[PDB]
């Protein structure tokens, strides 16, 4: 809790759905947003901060709260958009040999700034005396170890708590989330959403020699006609859907009502039947 990691993770597809099956978590209360909509929001970089506290202290981890650990080791303001993911770790972090390794900084002068790590080991000076290093009646060790033992009960067990602070500065967002895909349909007028490029057309097989860096493709006069498959390399062609004009030939509503329908721009195989120029 006095020296916690600050892992800056970015440039990946943050799939939070996988975290629901990695370890048997006991608390997944995200205060900022919902996990369903979290996978569809881009971010620049996530700050992962992990620590270990007791079971009765997990409630102290909240966006604004006082306590022996809430305002002395790690404080969260009223803007945390991440989660409070935490899980019990009383399977490998509890042996009967003396657990004098951890600490929680029982002594302090005032509340620390939120989202701050104070890595210090000086002797706590309780005023009215210059303590150049002494341990008696005026200046003591500001650190105290826990008493984690395997043969205990719930509430005072080693609980690993990890928070994921989010930020959105004036920087391009890298971590967006999972990007699913669908099956390919060829020779059929359907819709497409290829890498933001949305539209409709008939994905056909072309014979164009695209450059190894080009992705999209236009025509003589401002019309996208071919794109590169985001999957394995394949050259496609996006031709517009089946469209045309319709005209009605009618001898007039004075002798009969039989009419003829002329579809312009079609070879009678895309709608007696006759094919004219």
């Amino acid at each position: 809790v006095y020296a916690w990691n600050r892992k800056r993770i970015s440039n990946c597809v943050a799939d939070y759905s996988v975290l629901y099956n990695l370890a048997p978590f006991f608390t997944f209360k995200c205060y900022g947003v919902s996990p369903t909509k979290l996978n569809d929001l881009c971010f620049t970089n996530v700050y992962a901060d992990s620590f270990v506290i007791r079971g009765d202290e997990v409630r102290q981890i909240a966006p604004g709260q006082t306590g022996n650990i809430a305002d002395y080791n790690y404080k969260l303001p009223d803007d945390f958009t991440g989660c409070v993911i935490a899980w019990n770790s009383n399977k490998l972090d509890s042996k009967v040999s003396g657990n004098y390794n951890y600490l929680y900084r029982l002594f302090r002068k005032s509340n620390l700034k939120p989202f701050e790590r104070d890595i210090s080991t000086e002797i706590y000076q309780a005023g009215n005396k210059p303590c150049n290093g002494v341990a008696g009646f005026n200046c003591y060790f500001p650190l105290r170890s826990y008493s984690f033992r395997p043969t205990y009960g719930v509430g005072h067990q080693p609980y690993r708590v990890v928070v994921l602070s989010f930020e959105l500065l004036h920087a391009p967002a890298t971590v967006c989330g999972p990007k699913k895909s669908t099956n390919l349909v060829k020779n059929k007028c359907v819709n497409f959403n290829f890498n933001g490029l949305k539209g409709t057309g008939v994905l056909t097989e072309s014979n164009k020699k695209f450059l190894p860096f080009q992705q999209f493709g236009r025509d003589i006069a401002d019309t996208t006609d071919a794109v590169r498959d985001p999957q394995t390399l394949e050259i496609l062609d996006i031709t517009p859907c089946s469209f045309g004009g319709v005209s009605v030939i009618t001898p007039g509503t004075n002798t009969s009502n039989q009419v003829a329908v002329l579809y312009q721009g079609v070879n009678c195989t895309e709608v007696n039947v006759f094919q004219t120029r």
Partner: single-chain antibody
Amino acid sequence: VLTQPPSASGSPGQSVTISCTGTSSDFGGYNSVSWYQQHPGKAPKLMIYEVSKRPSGVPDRFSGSKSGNTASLTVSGLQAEDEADYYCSSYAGSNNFDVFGTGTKVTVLGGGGGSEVQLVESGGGLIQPGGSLRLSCAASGFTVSSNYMSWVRQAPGKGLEWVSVIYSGGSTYYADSVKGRFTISRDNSENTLYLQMNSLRAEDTAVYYCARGEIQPYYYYGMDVWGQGTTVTVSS
């Protein structure tokens, strides 16, 4: 709520071995069970804080091992003339007051801190029911603005209980008895630290004690120094 024997007078100093049962657990986390010897008149004095390593005092009271689910403080062979009350502390859970126990009469016979830092109070004689009276414990020695102090009240017959806990500079937790009607306000950071009544509900007649150290999360703090209390004497 803890379990303590009402009285203990048979076999003085041979098989007394008082304790405090009713825990049904492993004392939560840090196993630190303190023992307070409340004496009529002056303020109580600390006797032992851990299961071993007794502080500077009488060396005939030690071996406070935790047997079963209770700390059995070995008191046999101490003396045969004492009139006081032994109180034990447990239940160190997060934000849980009333850690003291009931009145245990450990009088083996029945019939037969002063200049350390400072000891001052307000002297609330004939307190009017209500209003706002301030009580201070100005200490010219240890800093009254950096250490973790507490306020504990006790009434005739009833035992002690946690009434006010205040951390270094960022916590103002109140007990469950007041439930909000008590507001702690710190005085100047270099003069003293006083309290506030804030319209008592006729239950604040108990005498107060401003301790320089915590009770349940007690630290060594060099030495445990207490101060005499004053009678409220409400006239509601």
